[PDB]
Amino acid sequence: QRGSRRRSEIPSVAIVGYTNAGKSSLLNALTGAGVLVENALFATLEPTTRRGEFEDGRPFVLTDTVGFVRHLPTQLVEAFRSTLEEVVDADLLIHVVDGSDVNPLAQINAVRTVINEVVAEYDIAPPPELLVVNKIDAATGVGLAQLRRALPDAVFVSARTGDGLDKLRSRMGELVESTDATVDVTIPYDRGDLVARVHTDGHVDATEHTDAGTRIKARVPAPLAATLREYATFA
Amino acid sequence: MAKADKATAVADIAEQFKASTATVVTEYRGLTVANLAELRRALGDSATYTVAKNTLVKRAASEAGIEGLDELFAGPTAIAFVKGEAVDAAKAIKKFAKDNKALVIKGGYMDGKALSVADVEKIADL
Amino acid sequence: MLIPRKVKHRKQHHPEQRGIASGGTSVSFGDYGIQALEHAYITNRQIESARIAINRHIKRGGKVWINIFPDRPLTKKPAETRMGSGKGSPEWWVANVKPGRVLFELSYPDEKTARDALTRAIHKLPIKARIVTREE
Amino acid sequence: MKVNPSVKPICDKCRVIRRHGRVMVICSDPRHKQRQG
Amino acid sequence: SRIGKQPVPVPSGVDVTINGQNLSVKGPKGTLTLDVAEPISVSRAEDGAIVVTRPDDERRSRSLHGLSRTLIANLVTGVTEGYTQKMEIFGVGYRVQLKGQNLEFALGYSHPVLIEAPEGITFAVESPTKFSVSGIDKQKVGQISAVIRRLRRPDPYKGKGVRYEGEQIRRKVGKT
Amino acid sequence: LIKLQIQAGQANPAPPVGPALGQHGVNIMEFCKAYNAATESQRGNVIPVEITVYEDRSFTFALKTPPAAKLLLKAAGVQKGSGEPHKTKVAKVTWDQVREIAETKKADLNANDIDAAAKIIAGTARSMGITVE
Amino acid sequence: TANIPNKLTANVRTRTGKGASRQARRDGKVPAVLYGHGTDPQHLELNARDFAAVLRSHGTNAILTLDIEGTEQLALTKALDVHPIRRNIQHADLLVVQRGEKVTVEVTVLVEGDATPGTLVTQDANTIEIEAEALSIPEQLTVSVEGVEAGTQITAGQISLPEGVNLISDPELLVVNVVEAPSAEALEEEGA
Amino acid sequence: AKRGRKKRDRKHSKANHGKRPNA
RNA sequence: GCCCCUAAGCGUGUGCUAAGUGGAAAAGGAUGUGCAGUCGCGAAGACAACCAGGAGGUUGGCUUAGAAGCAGCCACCCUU
RNA sequence: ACCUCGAUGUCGGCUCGUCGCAUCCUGGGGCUGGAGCAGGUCCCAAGGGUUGGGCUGUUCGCCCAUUAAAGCGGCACGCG
Known part of the structure; x- marks a missing residue:
């Protein structure tokens, strides 16, 4: 199923974190899904995905995984090895930690050493890690500045209230568009299976009706950017 | 499709004929609602207009002297009930006859007299 | 699930599945109902599983009545043991059903969605059953 | 084709017929066509 | 039965023959021969028509009513005016040529394929990308055109292959 | 035969409006300049514009009365439409106000009478639940 | 009648x-x-x-x-x-x-109307017993519920009986009860 | 269990009257 | 039990079955056929084929980019 | 606990087979979120084929090299 849905051009982002980190409600509040939650342990278990939406008008694959617990046996890690395959299939990995706690250094240390186990045994480059503190309304401002100084890649969020969601899309935007390869293609007149593709599948830069054809400066996704290299304007 | 609704139609159509003087009957087919909305504003200013069933007309025509259109009830029936002067609605429709040219007049009736298509043109001329 | 709070006797005989129903053969709370046509021991799981099925098709409004309650216990001894030496502990609670008994009842504005909701629950019961109305 | 004991019309353009002693559903959409057995 | 109610109108240009249930019609194109089912009987009225007669309302006899009427109907409009079907071929590099009583296709295969002409069926090429099949028997004309149309596995991505005249085939977008 | 509704003084973003009709082969820039030139007088609404297309790709665009679904909002003072009409009422509009909306909507509505148009606005008022008193 | x-x-x-x-x-x-x-x-x-x-x-x-x-x-x-x-x-x-005897008979009650959108109409008593003349029994009684707000009770005493008939059953018996629309969570809560 | 079924189902014949030894 | 093996009916009358059902089986799926009763419609032409329309407010309100007559929720009225 | 206790020799391996199809390869197709290459799922099909080694008594399993494939079962868990 993934081997037929990876062929498409949908960016994939993964949300991971401890149990009762509010990862389920983050997907509910960012999209509008009615995924049910319980203020207890193992609120959600199935690997849930739904569409993601943006400020600039881009869809992506937003994947909710299973919640972790501390001192997990590797037997249970292997038991849920089916739910954690999306970790390496993620363009961007979003990490959410308990913002009301004492030791954000331990929360990142435990999960990252858990996830990099799978990255190492799957031998792919680790994704750009992003941390999201939750419950800024239920958190103390002293620790807010401590992670401000320590992690510039950290962002304050309170999904239970909804502050700073527009900045999340901007941060999500700059790091997802960054994997694409800008192209300068010249599509001829006998390949008219591309005019709608360059306008909606990718991002347009400029367009001119030259003699050799239409010199289409454009930005297109990874399976769509290494793809027009035949008609490249320079080496 | 209970018969009571059709029975009320037969009484009403005849009573409007006996309340009106003349008629002009054309083909309604192929005319947009935008045209139908445009015409109904001009149609209802003085006259009235309906698109009823041929047999509903016949059972609502046998009472009074509007049985002089039996052989002409074959085709798309579009009654333009002109109540006042018979030339008002006949002049407006001849505007639409030239405006559209997809409408062809089937016939008309006035003063208990049976006419033809060319006679109707003269009626719109009178 | 539905279980009784306390039952005077914990290990009872098997309920007799003979004869036709003599009570509860008329819908008396809602508008539509399910009428049984075969004897069965409808456990508390099939009662609750069918209850969710009706709710998931109306999803907004209406009330569901369950006139049947799993009172009787049914026991089983541990597997891979020879016969004799006692009687097993009660495991699943069932409710005796005789044909003619009205099992579930629904109250919903439009009939088509009401009957389709009931047909969803009927397909989760161990019996043949039909849909009966409030009217005569 | 879907070989199922329980073939039903799925869309509003699905016709259910009999062809050589088998109940089958035939539709414009190839996804819908199915036979009994 | 409503289909079989009306009678087949014979024209001035053919002669019919009814010897029991072996009805044969001959005219300006050919000679066609037919046999009907045993309940049904067929004769002709003196007003230039052929009539099929079912004596019962049994399910078997009611189905053979409509079947017999259309068969004689096509037996008449065939032996006199005949049938033609206009076939088209689509895709770059796809052509057709005529080799006497045969047809040669070029449908992207390594080997140019041949289609023989069954008797009473005449191939008539018009343009390299459009042709027509004509004949006397409606059953045979539609049979060979069906084989012709199936010379390429269906392609909904670009529609390459032999199609019918006013076809609107199902297509889809082949993206990735 | 296409349709659009664009903000008063702003236009040409890429998702909403530009490629929304540039996929059919019409003008992209003069339409925005012309659209601004006509609405600068009104400037306080949204307009359903109905561009009618022919073989020659040249546009024929017309400007209609502001929608009753939004002309009611400015008449009542609220900004967000009601999520539960007939259960919680959030806007106030007087029968006089409906007459005021009918005066603006007198040109492009099917209503033959002033009071009949008032009914039409009342019929639209029920779709978001705006109190008519 | x-x-x-x-x-x-x-x-x-x-x-x-x-x-x-x-x-x-x-x-x-x-x-x-x-x-x-x-x-x-x-x-x-x-x-x-x-x-x-x-x-x-x-x-x-x-x-x-x-x-x-x-x-x-x-x-x-x-x-x-x-x-x-x-x-x-x-x-x-x-x-x-x-002819000319007052009998006691139970007759059915019908419900006609369409209440306000946030309500569910649950009828409690299917029938009600009245006293009527032998040849003039009302074949059915009607309770038109419309425009009613949140939960409202229609007992027997709110039924308009025809001429010459009496309500034998005590007027405190409840017939039609209109109740607020059950919530999407109430279906989950009720019956487990 | 074909053997166990074909033997029990042998009792529905005319001459046995719905009963047979060992069912 | 009565076509031949195999003693005695390829018995008589009225219907049903097309599956070798007769000569194994369930939940369930299903335009296979016979019988009985109902309901809506219809020579004021109901149904099938076919002609012509199938519009205005409008992009009905909340919701995310967005549901614009046509993922989701509420409302679901009016003029020709 | 019905046949056998005045005897019905019990696991693996070797030799030798024979059958079923609920098909691992080869053969024919329908659907596909099937562009191609390659797949996924279901239907038809028993003609032939289905390797050699390290560890363990081992069936089973893990591993090393390959191959079009290294099928699942019954026949006193076939065969003293």
Whole structure:
């Protein structure tokens, strides 16, 4: 199923974190899904995905995984090895930690050493890690500045209230568009299976009706950017 | 499709004929609602207009002297009930006859007299 | 699930599945109902599983009545043991059903969605059953 | 084709017929066509 | 039965023959021969028509009513005016040529394929990308055109292959 | 035969409006300049514009009365439409106000009478639940 | 109201019991017994089809005019017995009445209307017993519920009875209860 | 269990009257 | 039990079955056929084929980019 | 606990087979979120084929090299 849905051009982002980190409600509040939650342990278990939406008008694959617990046996890690395959299939990995706690250094240390186990045994480059503190309304401002100084890649969020969601899309935007390869293609007149593709599948830069054809400066996704290299304007 | 609704139609159509003087009957087919909305504003200013069933007309025509259109009830029936002067609605429709040219007049009736298509043109001329 | 709070006797005989129903053969709370046509021991799981099925098709409004309650216990001894030496502990609670008994009842504005909701629950019961109305 | 004991019309353009002693559903959409057995 | 109610109108240009249930019609194109089912009987009225007669309302006899009427109907409009079907071929590099009583296709295969002409069926090429099949028997004309149309596995991505005249085939977008 | 509704003084973003009709082969820039030139007088609404297309790709665009679904909002003072009409009422509009909306909507509505148009606005008022008193 | 009594024929049975009754229902009849102030029960059998047609139109309480052996006899169907599975009449009780007597009869209650959108109408009492003249029984009673707000109770005393009839049952009995629309979580909470 | 079924189902014949030894 | 093996009926009358059902089986799926009763419609032409329309407010309100007559929720009225 | 206790020799391996199809390869197709290459799922099909080694008594399993494939079962858990 993934081997037929990876062929498409949908960016994939993964949300991971401890149990009762509010990862389920983050997907509910960012999209509008009615995924049910319980203020207890193992609120959600199935690997849930739904569409993601943006400020600039881009869809992506937003994947909710299973919640972790501390001192997990590797037997249970292997038991849920089916739910954690999306970790390496993620363009961007979003990490959410308990913002009301004492030791954000331990929360990142435990999960990252858990996830990099799978990255190492799957031998792919680790994704750009992003941390999201939750419950800024239920958190103390002293620790807010401590992670401000320590992690510039950290962002304050309170999904239970909804502050700073527009900045999340901007941060999500700059790091997802960054994997694409800008192209300068010249599509001829006998390949008219591309005019709608360059306008909606990718991002347009400029367009001119030259003699050799239409010199289409454009930005297109990874399976769509290494793809027009035949008609490249320079080496 | 209970018969009571059709029975009320037969009484009403005849009573409007006996309340009106003349008629002009054309083909309604192929005319947009935008045209139908445009015409109904001009149609209802003085006259009235309906698109009823041929047999509903016949059972609502046998009472009074509007049985002089039996052989002409074959085709798309579009009654333009002109109540006042018979030339008002006949002049407006001849505007639409030239405006559209997809409408062809089937016939008309006035003063208990049976006419033809060319006679109707003269009626719109009178 | 539905279980009784306390039952005077914990290990009872098997309920007799003979004869036709003599009570509860008329819908008396809602508008539509399910009428049984075969004897069965409808456990508390099939009662609750069918209850969710009706709710998931109306999803907004209406009330569901369950006139049947799993009172009787049914026991089983541990597997891979020879016969004799006692009687097993009660495991699943069932409710005796005789044909003619009205099992579930629904109250919903439009009939088509009401009957389709009931047909969803009927397909989760161990019996043949039909849909009966409030009217005569 | 879907070989199922329980073939039903799925869309509003699905016709259910009999062809050589088998109940089958035939539709414009190839996804819908199915036979009994 | 409503289909079989009306009678087949014979024209001035053919002669019919009814010897029991072996009805044969001959005219300006050919000679066609037919046999009907045993309940049904067929004769002709003196007003230039052929009539099929079912004596019962049994399910078997009611189905053979409509079947017999259309068969004689096509037996008449065939032996006199005949049938033609206009076939088209689509895709770059796809052509057709005529080799006497045969047809040669070029449908992207390594080997140019041949289609023989069954008797009473005449191939008539018009343009390299459009042709027509004509004949006397409606059953045979539609049979060979069906084989012709199936010379390429269906392609909904670009529609390459032999199609019918006013076809609107199902297509889809082949993206990735 | 296409349709659009664009903000008063702003236009040409890429998702909403530009490629929304540039996929059919019409003008992209003069339409925005012309659209601004006509609405600068009104400037306080949204307009359903109905561009009618022919073989020659040249546009024929017309400007209609502001929608009753939004002309009611400015008449009542609220900004967000009601999520539960007939259960919680959030806007106030007087029968006089409906007459005021009918005066603006007198040109492009099917209503033959002033009071009949008032009914039409009342019929639209029920779709978001705006109190008519 | 002037309820036209129905004409039904009857025969007097030669034999009774379960042997004779089962044969009657197989042959196409339906047994019944006529009693009342006459103090002499007559065992009759009606035509099964005709009696059902009378019941299908004029409700359960249908005034009957039996011509038993050619003699007129006004009667009122006191009670019915229906098999719960096959839904057929097995037996009927026919009480003998004469014009100008106040009987006590249970009649059904209908509900007509369309309440405000945030409510669900749950009818409690299917029937209600009234006192009416022998030939002027109301065949059904109506409770038009419309424009009612959150939960409102319509008892028997809110029913508009026709002229010359009385509400025997106490007016405190509740008939129609309109309740707020159950919430999407209430379906989950109720019954577990 | 074909053997166990074909033997029990042998009792529905005319000459056995719905009963047989060992069912 | 009565076509031949195999003693005695390829018995008589009225219907049903097309599956070798007769000569194994369930939940359930299903335009296979015979019988009985109902309901809506219809020579004021109901149904099938076919002609012509199938519009205005409008992009009905909340919701995310967005549901614009046509993922989701509420409302679901009016003029020709 | 019905046949066998005045005997019905019990696991693996070797030799030798024979059958079923609920098919691992080869053969024919329908659907596909099937562009191609390659797949996924279902239907038809028993003609032939289905390797050699390290560890363990091992069936089973893990591993090393390959191959079009290294099928699942029954026959006293076939065969003293």
